[PDB]
């Protein structure tokens, strides 16, 4: 899918934060969006067609794949990218506000820094909430054999995944870049409070 | 499919409403169009190929899938996006009218607010009508086993769906964002009547 | 396929007709082109692969599908979109004519309204001709079981379609929007004759 | 495939011919390029996968399809579009020549009309040559049953095509528009000789 | 794949050579890039899926297809297009050099023609080297039956190709246009030496 | 996937290095990005579907393909392209710094060369690290028969690859262009130290 409407919105705010926000937007663009667009999404091209179970009961493959993957990793990461960008847009809702009021002055320690720090803490608690949800549901490593225990299958079946290693490497990689994007917010908030 | 012709039309009206209409257009662009373009549409890539029924009678799969899904959710949401945007375009039909009449004045509590509020109530009754149609037809949760009762199949068959959980999460998500877009119109109409 | 060469041609004439021609071009862009581009075309993605007949004679599926669908609905609608736009282009052939003659005057109840009304009646008779052809060939509702009576199959076979309801809804929808685009030409011609 | 490099070249010459060349370029853009881009090419999406022969000898399908279709119609039409556009480009090779010589004059019944008419007769003899090649090889109607007489198959086999009618309609349509583009060159050359 | 980065580089040098280099770039754009982009690449869409061998030994199809096609023709032509364009870029490395030195003069029979002729002879020897490699490996005509003599297959097998004629026509066509692009360099070098 | 966000970043720094950095960016654009975009990626279109093993045990194909390819070559090259470009961006972080400080001077042997050489040595050690990882894991030649020794398969199986030669040629080609991009950094650092 295209990423063009949010591109002009993230482009419109570029010279109102410090260097940390600029390199945070840089690692958001390069290491998250581009890497998902080229290599990451193509790896999950066949998640269901290459799935295979060792049985003959009809429909056991569907329910066992549904139990094994309640949601794919790539759509989870897409929702994570969406939910951590929109805290910054209200910052623009400050700017096009106050310039207009300066425009009103053209005719005839404020809330800016407060809106800034509340937006930053919102995006950080969103980041840590998504990391906690992923820790609770999936873990951080896919084995190559799953054991399925669902109706209408008989007693216990075992199903073999598709590429359990190439997914593991990218899971670890997205974990590391999310941790660095977590730490940078801590650095910037400490810098602003030190300049506070 | 591309979304470019309506993009310039929704871009052409941006500074004639309040902040509520602006953030309504924001959640229309981001949470509806982009999310449908990237992650939502790819989930329904195999609705029929991964469908499977437990029988041998030829053609029972076609009629049972037709009965189970009279219309897909993604095309329903596309029609919902189309039908709730066109009430605003007549607002532009006011503006390019009256500026031309001001242009005519260049040569030689009116109907604006009324057209505004009638357009807003039209888009809200369209929204609630589509929510009621979806409540009546589908419900809000897909089970993993369907029971089919149609000719030319024999007595009763049962067919297993494809990903009954990953669709359920996005159904709930589109429900929530439609409810918020419903409530925002109420907020803006009360604000205009309070300033009325 | 792309729609870009005719886009600049339909964009080049925008301020030489009344409001009826403008909203006619609006419903031409939104409700015909965009809806075909996003949702309508994807529904007919598998017209032949999901087709299925109840026999063993080799090649009966090909001839029975050929008899059932002499031409698909989506390509018929594409030809209908093409044939009803080109009557307006000759209007541009007037304008870039006469401005050049006004350009010639820069150096050293006419045929405009007549060309206008002949173009409008041509596009309306094209519209009603295509509606009559579709009424004669297909009807307006697809059943879910077809009976095929062609060589080299044996006596009579029956073949099951693919999604007979989701196609029916869009057939009815294109019928309604074609009827409204038919009525608007009547409104505009009566308005011009009343101002005649 | 994209059509963008030749687009700027056909756009660069637009105001150096009469109205006949302009409407010839118009029917070249609309009725040839767009119709091939949207509807025509998608009809030949499965020419080989839907092909089917009534035998068991391995590889008979490949040689019988190769004998039945030495070249597809759509690539033939693509080559026809390419070969009839390049006679006009040398006209540009006149213009950017002589303006430069007029540029040289800025510093310190000719060959134009002759190059024009030789380019037009070249494009017309190319058009009639391609029509004659298509008449000689294919004819103008595809039957629904082919009889194949090639090694390594046994004595005689018969193979069933894919959509013999929807291809026939577009074959007839491309024939008609090629005939009109043939006649327009005759009209323009007679007009220039009458003004000669 | 896209061709956009080298497009601006080939566009940036357009008015520093004679008419022969201009029409050479013209036949490079039209007859090589566009024809590969639209019709040529789609013909080789199924090179392996439509391949078929007459045996039951598992894996014989893979090794026999590997022996029959060490590299496909379309990727060979892509490498040929890449390797014969980069001799011209150093010409730009002259121009943006010397203009800068003229820029230096703004502040406070040379090597141009030599770099020109060395670039032209490099691109011609690259062209003839690629023609010789294609003559040595493949020949210029694909038969319709291949005989395979590789382990782990038994004694001798025979495999049937996919479309042996439609590939032959384009092989001959690319041969002819490569020969014309070979001859044009000879014409231009003789013209420069005659003006030398 | 698209490559557009990093394109403007690599375009924004073009006139702050010597000719070696310019031709290094040239071979980065042409021989790495374009060649991956057109021909290289299409060769690995069917890495798993054309994979084939000589057994009947269910799921042995999945684990044997997973052991044979822990990560594909094309995604490895994508990560290599990403990791060797970002050392240069900090150079921009110098420039938009110091110009702003010159902008500050507008109102009222330094660290530039040091940041330059540290960025260049970082990108070279990244290049040699990726070459060493590829040497350690894969080698530089793919055989056509693999021997698999993993549970749940029985004792030893053998699996046949897909196109072992067309991949070998591009492996060797990427090796050569990576070696040249390695040597050019050595040339430029020696040139700067000689001018040091």
Token pair listed for D55:
């035998």
Which letter, b or e, does each residue of B127-165 get, where b requires 16 or more Cβ atoms within 10 Å of its Cβ? Answer: beebeeebeeeeeeebebebebeeeebeeebebbbbbbe
Residue the block writes with tokens 């608690």 = A125
Three state DSSP letters for C55-106: CCCCCHHHHHHHHHCCCCHHHHHHHHHHHCCCCCHHHHHHHHHHHHHHHHHH
Q: Which residues in chain F are contacts of E93 at CB distance < 8 A?
A: 19, 23
Question: Who contacts E6 (Cβ-Cβ below 8 Å, separation ≥6)?
Answer: E85, F29, F30, F34
Q: Find out whether F196 and F46 touch, Cβ atoms under 8 Å.
A: no
Q: Can you give the C-alpha Rg of chain D in angstroms?
A: 22
DSSP 3-state percent helix, strand, coil across chain B (nearest 5):
65, 5, 30
- Going from the C-alpha of C76 to that of each of A125, C20, C41, D40, the distances in angstroms are 54, 26, 12, 11
Breaks (C-N over 2.5 A) in chain B follow: 108
Chains E and D touch (3+ CB pairs under 8 A): yes
Cα A184 from Cα A24, distance rounded (Å):
7
Of E34, E54, E169, the CB nearest to D6: E34
Provide the 10 A C-beta neighbour count for residue C69: 19
Count of beta carbons in the 10 Å neighbourhood of residue F66: 20
Name the nearest CA neighbour of C25 among C176, C170, C184, C179: C184
User: Which residue has tokens 């062609």?
Assistant: C150
Residues of A in contact with F44 (CB under 8 A): none
Is residue F159 within a helix (H) or strand (E), and if so which, with residue range?
strand F157-160
Nearest by CB to residue C63, choosing from D29, D30, D160, is: D160
Question: Could you give the CA distance from residue B166 to residue B171 in angstroms, rounded to a whole number?
Answer: 9
After which residues is chain D discontinuous, taking C to N > 2.5 Å? 108
What tokens were used for C139?
């009807």
The answer to whether the beta carbons of residues C144 and B66 sit under 8 Å apart is yes
* D24: Cα separation from own chain's centroid: 14
In chain D, which residues touch C (CB < 8 A)? 19, 23, 26, 29-31, 33-35, 37-39, 41-43, 46, 50, 52, 54, 144-145, 160-166, 169
Q: What share of chain C is helix, strand, coil (3-state, %, to 5)?
A: 65, 5, 30
Report yes or no: E178 and E85 within 8 Å, Cβ to Cβ: no
Residues A79, F111: contact at Cβ < 8 Å? no
C-alpha C111, offset from chain centre: 29
Task: Find the closest chain E residue to F144 by CA distance.
Answer: E63
From CA B142, how far away is CA B164, in angstroms rounded?
Answer: 6
Residues of chain E contacting residue D72, judged by C-beta atoms under 8 Å apart: 166
* Bridge partners for C146 per DSSP: C159
Which of D30, D46, D163 minimises the CB distance to C66? D163
Phi-psi region of B146 (alpha: psi -120 to 50; beta: other; left: phi over 0): beta
For residue D29, give both structure tokens: 């853009």
Q: Radius of gyration of chain B from Cα atoms?
A: 22
Q: At A179, list the tokens.
A: 């941790």
| Spatial CB neighbours of F66, under 8 Å, sequence gap ≥ 6 | A144, A163, A164, A165
From B167, which residue of chain A is nearest by alpha-carbon distance? A71
- In degrees, rounded to 5, the angle at the alpha carbon of residue A71 between the alpha carbons of residues A66 and A76 is 170
Q: Give Cα separations from B32 to B3, B76, C89, D64 (angstroms).
A: 12, 13, 36, 50
3-state per-residue secondary structure call for E24-91: HHHHHHHHHHHHHHHHHHHHCCCCCCCCEECCCCCCHHHHHHHHHCCCCHHHHHHHHHHHCCCCCHHH
Cα–Cα distance for residue pair C38/C40, rounded to 1 Å: 6
Which residues in chain A have Cβ-Cβ distances shorter than 8 Å to B39?
Answer: 1, 74-75, 78-79
Q: Which residue among E29, E161, E169 places its CB closest to the CB of D71?
A: E169
CA F33 to CA F36: how far, in whole Å? 5
Question: How many Cβ atoms are within 10 Å of D55's Cβ, its own excluded?
Answer: 15
Q: C4-195, which class in CATH? A: mainly alpha
Q: Nearest-5° angle of CA B33, CA C19, CA C170?
A: 45
Question: CA–CA separation, C185 vs A196, rounded Å?
Answer: 67
Lookup: tokens for B26: 């924001």
Token look-up 């020696």 returns F190
Residue of B35, B52, B144 lying closest to A66 (CB–CB)? B144
For B38-62, b/e burial (b = at least 16 CB within 10 A) is: bbbbbbbeebbebbebeeeeebbbb
If phi over 0 gives left and psi between -120 and 50 gives alpha, with beta otherwise, what is residue C139?
left
Chains B and E touch (3+ CB pairs under 8 A): no
Residues F44/F126, Cβ–Cβ less than 8 Å: no
Tell me how far apart the alpha carbons of residues E83 and F193 are, in angstroms, rounded to a whole number: 33
Q: How far is CA E117 from CA B53, C75, C151, E121, E127, in A?
A: 71, 54, 69, 6, 15
Contacts of C180 (CB under 8 A, 6+ apart): C27
State the nearest Cα–Cα gap between F148 and chain E, in angstroms.
15
Instruction: Resolution in Å, one decimal, please.
Output: 3.6
Q: Which residues, 6+ apart, have CB-to-CB distance to D38 below 8 Å?
A: C1, C2, C3, C78
Q: Which helix (H) or strand (E) holds D54?
A: none
CA–CA dist E174, E158 (Å, integer): 28
Residue A102 in tokens:
């300066």
Opening angle at CA B144, ends B142 and B145, nearest 5: 115
Distance separating alpha carbons of residues B14 and D180, to the nearest angstrom: 48
Q: What is the distance between the alpha carbons of residues E100 and D196, in angstroms, rounded to a whole number? A: 52
Most A CBs within 10 A among B4, B32, B34, B36, hence the mutation to make, goes to B34
Q: What ranges make up the beta strands (E) of chain B?
A: 52-53, 145-148, 157-160
Q: Which candidate in C9, C58, C94 is best for mutational testing of the D interface (most D CBs within 10 A)?
A: C58
| Distance to chain F for A38, nearest Cα, Å | 4
Q: List residues of chain A with CB under 8 Å from any CB of chain B.
A: 1-3, 5-6, 48, 58-59, 62-63, 65-66, 69-72, 74-75, 78-79, 82, 86, 89, 93, 152
Shortest Cα distance, chain D CAs vs residue E160, angstroms:
6
- CA separation for the pair D121, A20 (Å, rounded): 67
- Cβ–Cβ under 8 Å, residues F175 and F97: no
SS3 sequence, chain A? CCCCHHHHHHHHCCCCCCHHHHHHHHHHHHHHHHHHHHHHHHHCCCCCCCCEECCCCCCHHHHHHHHHCCCCHHHHHHHHHHHCCCCCHHHHHHHHHHHHHHHHHHHCCCHHHHHHHHHHHHHHHHHHHHHHHHHHHCCCCCCCEEEECCCCCCCCEEEECCCCCHHHHHHHHHHHHHHHHHHHHHHHHHHHHHCC
């Amino acid at each position: 899918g295209d990423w063009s409407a949010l591109g002009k919105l993230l482009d419109k705010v570029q010279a109102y934060s410090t260097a940390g926000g600029k390199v945070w937007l840089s690692v958001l663009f390069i290491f998250r969006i581009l890497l998902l667009g080229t290599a990451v999404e193509s790896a999950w091209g066949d998640e269901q067609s290459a799935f295979r179970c060792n049985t003959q009961q009809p429909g056991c493959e569907n329910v066992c794949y549904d139990k094994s993957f309640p949601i794919s990793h790539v759509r989870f990461w897409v929702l994570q990218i969406i939910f951590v960008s929109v805290p910054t847009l209200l910052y623009l809702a400050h700017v096009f506000y106050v310039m207009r009021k300066e425009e009103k002055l053209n005719k005839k320690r404020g809330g800016l820094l407060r809106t800034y720090i509340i937006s930053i803490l919102f995006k950080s608690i969103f980041e840590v909430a998504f990391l906690l949800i992923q820790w609770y549901i999936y873990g951080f490593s896919l084995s190559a054999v799953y054991t399925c225990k669902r109706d209408p299958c008989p007693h216990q079946v075992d199903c073999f995944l598709s590429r359990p290693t190439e997914k593991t490497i990218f899971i670890i990689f997205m974990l590391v870049v999310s941790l660095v994007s977590l730490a940078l917010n801590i650095i910037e908030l400490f810098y602003v409070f030190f300049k506070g």
